């Protein structure tokens, strides 16, 4: 009943996507209608523009705050942490669910003013759903599932979530795999793929309701490099900004006082810049989130068009011709693009900071695309005829590449490129874009940590494995430091009354079996229930017939923490005994490991 489980989650996710998306569409449409209709006067119009983005965000913030600390503001990093082995029980709990979806919806509605995507939150939701499903299974049939299985399920859920938001089965899962953990099995991948497929099928069902040259390649590479550089710049800012936010007593105090209020303020600020007559002509502000991307990836070469004919500024953004928003007479299209970039960067970090359920991939992708588009435009201007069979330069492709590359750099993921391709439809120029992406990754992974990684660092979540730009003394600690030094030895030489007493007292899941009280040397392990049963009906007991489970593995006190962690992850274990010169000294489990990790993180 694994396949069935996989199926069930996926369909649900798809349904959620459909509903939420629909809601977003409707509300946004309504807002648009209101904006046009309210009137010519600036005050009223301003209010309309500002209130809607503010209010929704505030509501979302409110929803986030009241439930539990890890309820809102976390998507991928927490998931990653969980995968790494250190589990946060508050994260997977479903009491969260009801608060978060609504918040996400609100965020989406708020749209291109707030400028936030839906991925991470969606992924989190999916994971939660998966967990819930698992729990039921555990309850309804058999016993409580092994940790490994649960982890796998979570991973699958995450993959499905990532696919769903995209509307892309092949790439999304891959992306999830890349980001979400360090190593990954093939079965997991397969499961993810299956989930994605299911989601796609559901979506389909729910439709009734509703040849580049070497110079070009070189250019693409350059573009990719540029994107990577930009990505790197962004990441540092993002991390530093987050740190600052965490620190500042004034800021921190304010946050403590009113989570909603700060968010509201941020929204207001965003609106003030993002107002259409004030600075929206320059930023191409008045576009939906999807619309922006479409505009960026439009087949027409803008500069040339502009030169040919001065384009009109329509009353509402033209469904066929979205690029008209990017033009201004005083600021050439290039200028507008530049404004969008820098201004977006300034805003984007701020947006990321605000405490709410929100994804930060889509915005990054858009940013990447914008730069690419700009580059393409520049190239076009340089070579109006084009590069010499004299083919014209298509900036759409460039834009796409930029989107792929910058985003990849940010996230440390080549499967961004794949996703881009999928979105496009055409794999005809698979290479140059891919190359660019790779270049970006190289530049960015060598200078900065991933966006997700950065966020994790800022949080100070218990993630043992190495991250760039994060000094920590993890190699120094050994098992002797963090082992559970208190244990309950049961030796073959001991009396029966004593054993009984011990049983009455502790009821530990697995007692060690020892040779003798003096030596304290392990010869196996005993389960507790079985022992109890035996008592109801130690050498003598053994003779009579209680089953001994042999100790399959033994850690030393002088072993490193890292190694232990790896063992726990990879072999998929629950608990393990420690032995110094053969003696039962410690009992290592996840509880202790987790504690150690926490200590390492937070001195």
């Amino acid at each position, epitope marked *: 009943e694994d396949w069935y489980f996989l199926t069930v989650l996926g369909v649900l996710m798809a349904l959620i996507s459909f509903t939420m998306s629909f809601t977003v569409g409707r509300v946004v449409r309504a807002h648009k209608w209101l904006y046009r209709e309210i009137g010519d006067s600036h005050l009223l119009r301003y209010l309309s523009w500002t209130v809607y983005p503010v209010a929704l965000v505030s509501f979302s913030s409110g929803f986030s705050q009241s439930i539990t600390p890890f309820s809102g503001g976390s998507g991928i990093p927490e998931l990653k942490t969980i995968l790494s082995g250190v589990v946060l029980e508050d994260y997977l709990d479903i009491k969260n669910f009801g608060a978060k979806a609504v918040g996400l919806t609100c965020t989406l509605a708020s749209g291109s003013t707030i400028f936030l995507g839906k991925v991470g939150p969606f992924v989190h939701l999916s994971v939660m759903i998966a967990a819930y499903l698992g729990r039921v299974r555990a309850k309804a049939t058999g016993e409580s599932e092994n940790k490994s299985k649960r982890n796998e399920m979570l991973v699958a859920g995450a993959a499905v979530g990532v696919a769903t938001v995209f509307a892309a089965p092949f790439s999304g899962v891959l992306f999830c795999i890349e980001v979400v953990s360090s190593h990954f099995s093939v079965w997991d991948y397969w499961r993810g793929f299956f989930a994605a497929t299911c989601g796609a099928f559901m979506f389909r069902l729910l439709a009734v309701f509703n040849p580049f040259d070497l110079p070009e390649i070189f250019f693409f590479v350059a573009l990719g490099a540029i994107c990577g550089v930009a990505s790197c710049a962004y990441l540092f800012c993002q991390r530093k900004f987050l740190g600052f936010v965490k620190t500042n007593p004034v800021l921190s105090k304010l946050m403590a006082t009113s989570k909603p209020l700060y968010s509201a303020l941020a929204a207001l600020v965003l609106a003030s810049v993002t107002y259409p007559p004030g600075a929206g002509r320059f930023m191409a502000s008045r576009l939906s989130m999807r619309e922006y991307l479409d505009s960026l990836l439009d087949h027409n070469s803008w500069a*040339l068009l*502009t*030169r*040919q*004919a001065s384009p*009109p500024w329509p009353v509402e953004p033209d469904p066929q*011709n979205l690029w008209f928003e990017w033009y201004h007479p005083q600021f050439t299209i290039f200028g507008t693009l530049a404004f969008f970039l820098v201004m977006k960067f300034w805003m984007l970090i701020l947006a990321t900071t605000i405490p709410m359920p929100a994804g930060y991939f889509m915005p990054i992708f858009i940013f990447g695309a914008a730069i690419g588009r700009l580059l393409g435009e520049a190239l076009s201007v340089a070579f109006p005829e084009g590069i010499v069979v004299t083919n014209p330069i298509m900036p759409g492709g460039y834009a796409l590449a930029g989107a792929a590359a910058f985003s990849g750099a940010v996230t440390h993921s080549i499967s961004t490129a794949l996703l881009a391709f999928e979105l496009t439809g055409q794999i005809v120029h698979a290479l140059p874009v891919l190359m660019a992406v790779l270049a970006a990754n190289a530049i960015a992974q060598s200078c900065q940590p991933s966006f997700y990684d950065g966020t994790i660092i800022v949080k100070k979540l218990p993630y043992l494995p190495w991250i760039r730009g994060r000094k920590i003394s993890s190699h120094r600690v050994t098992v002797e430091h963090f082992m559970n030094r208190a244990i309950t030895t049961l030796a073959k030489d001991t009396p029966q009354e004593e054993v009984v007493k011990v049983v009455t007292s502790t009821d530990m899941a697995e007692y060690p079996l020892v040779a003798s009280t003096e030596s304290q040397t392990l010869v196996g392990t005993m389960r507790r229930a079985q022992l109890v049963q035996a008592l109801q009906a130690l050498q003598d007991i053994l003779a009579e017939g209680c089953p001994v489970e042999p100790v399959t593995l033994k850690l030393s006190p002088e072993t490193s923490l890292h190694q232990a962690h790896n063992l726990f992850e990879l072999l998929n274990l629950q608990s393990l005994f420690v032995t110094s010169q053969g003696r039962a000294v410690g009992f290592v489990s996840w509880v202790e490991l987790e504690k150690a990790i926490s200590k390492l993180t937070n001195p």
Partner: antibody, heavy 111, light 107 residues
């Protein structure tokens, strides 16, 4: 209100290079637009010649790359053609235009 | 070069009727098509710079539609002053190609 006024010789002999001077009033030639040249034959079929950018990068029709040469003087705000190797088939009414927005009145060229 | 074919080459309608001149492009143009009006003798004044966008000072009756490969100039309520040739041109690619246009007479 951008206004373009052509001027030059009407009658020309074949195998002798012709030149048309288009003066501009309203906008500067140094602005970022497509300052194109176009001609219409006696049978009323239009052919696009080419244009100069703000910087000076000339772009021509592939079919007429050999013979066409287009230049400007930024002081006077004007456009100069220098169409060489003139043939009786080239006989047409010429049109000096700023992109697509505004077209000049034009002059009738005769070979 | 990208050829602009168009039809119908000649038309004859009364005052008040509708006329629809259609242009067809070989390759994909997008929406980057401009329509003109040339009265015999005078310069060809632009009417519609992008399909579904009239130039300032032009009557509302001159409507333009289409995208991709096929485009249509529709004129409703024809007056006596609309005796003219009407060309479509594209400017997505280079070189810029004009259709031969259509001479229009009235009864």
């Amino acid at each position: 209100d951008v206004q373009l006024q052509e001027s030059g010789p009407g009658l020309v002999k074949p195998s002798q290079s012709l030149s048309l001077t288009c003066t501009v009033t309203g906008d500067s030639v140094t602005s970022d637009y497509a300052w194109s040249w176009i001609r219409q034959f006696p049978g009323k079929k239009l052919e696009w010649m080419g244009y100069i950018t703000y910087s000076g990068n000339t772009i021509y029709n592939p079919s007429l790359k050999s013979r066409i040469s287009i230049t400007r003087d930024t002081s006077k705000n004007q456009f100069f053609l220098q169409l060489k190797s003139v043939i009786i088939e080239d006989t047409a009414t010429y049109y000096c235009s700023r992109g697509v927005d505004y077209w000049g009145q034009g002059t009738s060229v005769t070979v | 070069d990208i050829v602009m074919t168009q039809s119908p080459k000649f038309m004859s309608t009364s005052v008040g009727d509708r006329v629809s001149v259609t242009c067809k492009a070989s390759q994909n143009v997008g929406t980057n098509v401009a329509w003109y009006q040339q009265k015999p003798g005078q310069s060809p004044k632009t009417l519609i710079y992008w399909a579904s966008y009239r130039y300032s000072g032009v009557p509302d009756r001159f409507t333009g539609s289409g995208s991709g490969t096929d485009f249509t100039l529709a004129i409703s309520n024809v007056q006596s002053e609309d005796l003219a040739e009407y060309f479509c041109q594209q400017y997505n690619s280079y070189p810029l190609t004009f259709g031969s246009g259509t001479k229009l007479e009235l009864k």
